[PDB]
Ligand binder design. Sequence first.
Ligand SMILES: *C/C=C(C)/C=C/C=C(C)/C=C/C1=C(C)CCCC1(C)C
Ligand SMILES: *C/C=C(C)/C=C/C=C(C)/C=C/C1=C(C)CCCC1(C)C
Ligand SMILES: *C/C=C(C)/C=C/C=C(C)/C=C/C1=C(C)CCCC1(C)C
Lengths: 216, 216, 216
Amino acid sequence: GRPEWIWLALGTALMGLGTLYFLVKGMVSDPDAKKFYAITTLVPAIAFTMYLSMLLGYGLTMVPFQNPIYWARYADWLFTTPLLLLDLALLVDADQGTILALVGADGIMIGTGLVGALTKVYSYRFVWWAISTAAMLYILYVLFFGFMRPEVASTFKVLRNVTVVLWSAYPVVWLIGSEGAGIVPLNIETLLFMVLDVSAKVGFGLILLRSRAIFG
Amino acid sequence: GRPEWIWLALGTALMGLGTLYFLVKGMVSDPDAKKFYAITTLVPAIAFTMYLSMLLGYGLTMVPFQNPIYWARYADWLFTTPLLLLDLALLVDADQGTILALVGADGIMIGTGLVGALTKVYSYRFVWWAISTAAMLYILYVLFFGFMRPEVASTFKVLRNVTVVLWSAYPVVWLIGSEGAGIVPLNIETLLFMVLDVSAKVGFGLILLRSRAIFG
Amino acid sequence: GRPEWIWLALGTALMGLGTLYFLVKGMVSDPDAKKFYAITTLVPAIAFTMYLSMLLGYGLTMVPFQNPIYWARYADWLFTTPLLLLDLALLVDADQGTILALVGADGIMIGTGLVGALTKVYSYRFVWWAISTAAMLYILYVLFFGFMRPEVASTFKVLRNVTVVLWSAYPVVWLIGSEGAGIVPLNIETLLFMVLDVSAKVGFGLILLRSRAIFG
Ligand SMILES: *C/C=C(C)/C=C/C=C(C)/C=C/C1=C(C)CCCC1(C)C
Ligand SMILES: *C/C=C(C)/C=C/C=C(C)/C=C/C1=C(C)CCCC1(C)C
Ligand SMILES: *C/C=C(C)/C=C/C=C(C)/C=C/C1=C(C)CCCC1(C)C
């Protein structure tokens, strides 16, 4: 019924297939590699469920500021974005202190994202967007300045670059889409997030899980 | 007022008493044993609070598909089921990678359980049930195939068998009860969950905390 | 508009400034010290966001028992109180078992706090208050009886004393304020929590982050 259904359906499909691929691929005894397979398989598994929830209409609510807001995205990102950061952190043997900073900053990013998404005073939505963007920028700063076997170095560099590029798109899509200024229709916005989500999840995992960096 | 009150009241009582028993019993210097006492005491403490919430009417909502759904169960299981899995994982010195898989799969199980519980399209409730059951089955697979001092071996075998049997009952009760097909009345369903919950929590803890497997 | 706005605004300001101070101060290579800076900076960062949410009206709901309840407090405390306990636990090199007990007990404290805050049967609100207070008392007991370099000893003693005093005020404020008996107006209650929150967060962090106890 809703025009964006096609992109929700494809996202569900692609997340589903990616999960099954990583699950089959991970069938691995090396403790380190097992950690990467676990993190990297859980990511699209979670996204699969949240995409499904949006397709079926459960992960959608109306916010008066009567705007269709897919809140399920934030339930997804609350878990999947810290997991993706753990993949990076583990590659480089990050100190626990740096892990907590990343995870905590990420929680703030998604939580303020959600508050902004659900806020009924239009102008205040963008205050929450700004705070969330600050947390994102802190995360990007830590990834470049806050942190090594050569193969770990090469793979970390690729994944970090992928991360900086894709993650930076999210706040732009939100600002111009139905959560923000409403300059890009919900249908197109759903498509953008779908492309970003699959790349950031399945794309990312493929690069990581095909590299020898994950073995001790 | 509501017929199931008696089973909510007994569950609250039994969870309460089990918590106090484990608390008194744990009054223990061995680091390993302290970890088991903590996990195993927190479990029925959480369940106590969620049983209380249901007795008092706070953990109950009406879902139109006007069906009384005790959502408090899922707030309980979200924390207590991973904790029970940590008890198992620690016994056998599981690799962190295997722990994340178990915990993550468990989160998916309960989260999709909850979505199914609260879904307003009747047919879709059972799609969520199926996904949750898949996650449960993955958990059971890991417990048997994804993993040792003899006393650890004996105790792990008992607890794992208890786990496989009791946990497998939960999806059956849900399917036939008020969350699913509505073939078994809410009153009887509440009783089944109460028996399962106490066994899976207090029964489980008694077997674990009386074994010498918990000491290094 | 609402009289308590001034205290929400100052709390937001003070939490904001404290976060920036700790962030600048932490600009530190020692792994141990990094852990303390992370925990201690995240704390007022979270509180900043939740104070903002209350100022802007998002973190407030009406509970019929038509009472204005700031639920945002509990979203704050759910994360910040375990973090503050981790600061203490790490100082003294607590066993993981003791950490889980503290964190778990803290989760119960805040969760039952929230249930009480949102409960529509007046008398039952204080049952939840009593359970939460029991969990708090268990936490205080562990801090004194459940647990060392001299500088670690001195700093831990100060922070623990600060903790026992400030934390014990929270249940009293709740009982006499708008969540409980309604003997102290919401405006004054908001002020009390603001003073307690800043002391418990910024005060606490200043004492910790100025001590040499945080370096290995
Ligand atoms: C698989 C999903 C991924 C990698 C999602 C990343 C999402 C973000 C980095 C979102 C950031 C946002 C802001 C920085 C501002 C407010 C809007 C958000 C939550 C989209
Ligand atoms: C103390 C509580 C325990 C051990 C609960 C275990 C609960 C489950 C294994 C529930 C499983 C479910 C499914 C597998 C399908 C959907 C319905 C659920 C959530 C009951
Ligand atoms: C920064 C915030 C801090 C340190 C908050 C501490 C809050 C508590 C210790 C609250 C305790 C409560 C009870 C013990 C009973 C019910 C009411 C609560 C949640 C305020």
